[PDB]
Ligand binder design. Sequence first.
Ligand code: HEM
Ligand code: BHF
Ligand code: BHF
Ligand code: BHF
Ligand code: BHF
Length: 450
Amino acid sequence: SRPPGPFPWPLPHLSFARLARRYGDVFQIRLGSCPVVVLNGERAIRQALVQQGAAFAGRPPFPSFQVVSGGRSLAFGRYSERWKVQRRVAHSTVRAFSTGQPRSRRVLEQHVLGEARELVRLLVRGSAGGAFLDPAPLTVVAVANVMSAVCFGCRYSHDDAEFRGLLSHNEKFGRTVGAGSLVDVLPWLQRFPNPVRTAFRDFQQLNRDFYSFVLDKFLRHRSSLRPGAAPRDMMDAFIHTVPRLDLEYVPATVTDIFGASQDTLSTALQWLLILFTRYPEVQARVQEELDRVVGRDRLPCMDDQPHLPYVMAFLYEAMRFSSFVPVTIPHATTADTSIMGYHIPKDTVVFVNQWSVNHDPVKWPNPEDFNPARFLDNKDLASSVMIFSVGKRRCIGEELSKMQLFLFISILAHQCNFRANPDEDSKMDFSYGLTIKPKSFTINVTLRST
Ligand code: HEM
Ligand SMILES: O=c1cc(-c2ccccc2)oc2c1ccc1ccccc12
Ligand SMILES: O=c1cc(-c2ccccc2)oc2c1ccc1ccccc12
Ligand SMILES: O=c1cc(-c2ccccc2)oc2c1ccc1ccccc12
Ligand SMILES: O=c1cc(-c2ccccc2)oc2c1ccc1ccccc12
């Protein structure tokens, strides 16, 4: 009555496809001490998260998830009548900046082009001569600075000590999440001294310390915001949006907002850049379009988003091709329910394999081939690209990140031409972990004319 019996796992998102190509689109595995249901087909995923949304809108009660954002994290909070309220106002407030309305063209846009302009500088200048440089560190800083200005209005300068403290936080966080995830499925590691416990204890103090940082900006904001003024950033907007929830939920969602923003947008920029170098034809087609729609005396902006159907097509498939978020945040069942004729008890840990969707040869004919033209005359097969999830837990920053990413590649593609390194293999290897990042690579960025 239940899906193929738990197979001890590990024997990562690819192994899941290997066992989905043997025991069907839905199977179970024993993960350390936790039993997990893996969904792979789009049928299984859409039928679970969309048609049976409420039944799957939950989250496990993992140790990792408890200290993040001071316990009121939206990304990891359980499914509650109060979480539903948080999500509703969270999603609505952050998409208010995705749009082209006044709010958005004030906070997001001119901070993005402000940092994009700064980034093409450091690239063009870092490749001076025939020099080559690794762009990955510059995508982390760029993404951290933009969301800094978006959540607290503070667009730091790369000298700033407070900013070098944010970058340092993000690094330590990425270096200890592994330990946190290991304590989630092997909780017996908190019983005796070990490296994972020391790293997990470091993990949790890291979150306490950073949520403390965000909660400081919350007061200085609330203390300083006159009642008739429009929001200077996204924490002002959340202050204005105030069952009902504690005042402390405001900085908790703003910590989630900044947090989930870092490694994801960083990883995306790295994919967009390496793809330009390994696929010069699309680089040429992309930028040449920007000329026909933006000219050559002004940097692109949000007003050009609809008149640039290809730059988005290049984005929508960059996401499909890499699927750098191959598995969403673990889900949990709110009650007993059915999937593909399989019984699922309540409170079961369920994984969601997005990579299986974006690489099922049936759905996308030649999945391992890069061709943005898939999404062109598109409108609603770009919504089939599953890099953000679907259902009640779908990313609340979907539209904010494709709007922010677009501006980055448009300003970058508008100003410069990106060249690969000849000493490097024409192939793109993949670096797995947290996200699927392109293994270290070099590029030479030059200022173009056309
Ligand atoms: C390319 C950039 C991004 C990608 C690919 C991405 C992807 C995802 C994924 C896969 C999830 C888990 C969904 C699930 O478990 O079903 C998620 C959740 C979430 N994302 Fe993003 N994300 C990105 C950027 C952002 C940004 C910029 C924000 C905020 C401005 C954000 C805010 C959130 C939040 C709050 C959640 C938790 C929502 C919930 O659990 O109800 N993300 N995202
Ligand atoms: O401080 C964080 C760092 C990071 C992080 C992740 C990868 C690399 C570097 C930092 O993520 C988060 C953070 C905080 C809250 C989050 C809530 C939901 C999802 C992610 C969050
Ligand atoms: O515990 C996790 C395991 C895993 C995981 C990843 C690959 C294979 C098995 C589990 O992923 C996540 C976990 C927790 C939070 C996450 C947030 C965003 C994206 C992924 C997350
Ligand atoms: O076997 C693994 C278990 C786990 C794991 C980690 C924490 C809890 C449970 C399983 O993660 C990975 C595994 C294998 C490869 C990975 C590659 C990149 C990122 C994570 C990987
Ligand atoms: O971005 C993440 C990726 C991952 C992750 C874990 C395993 C494989 C790939 C990504 O985990 C987390 C993330 C963020 C916050 C977390 C908080 C508690 C526990 C795990 C978290």
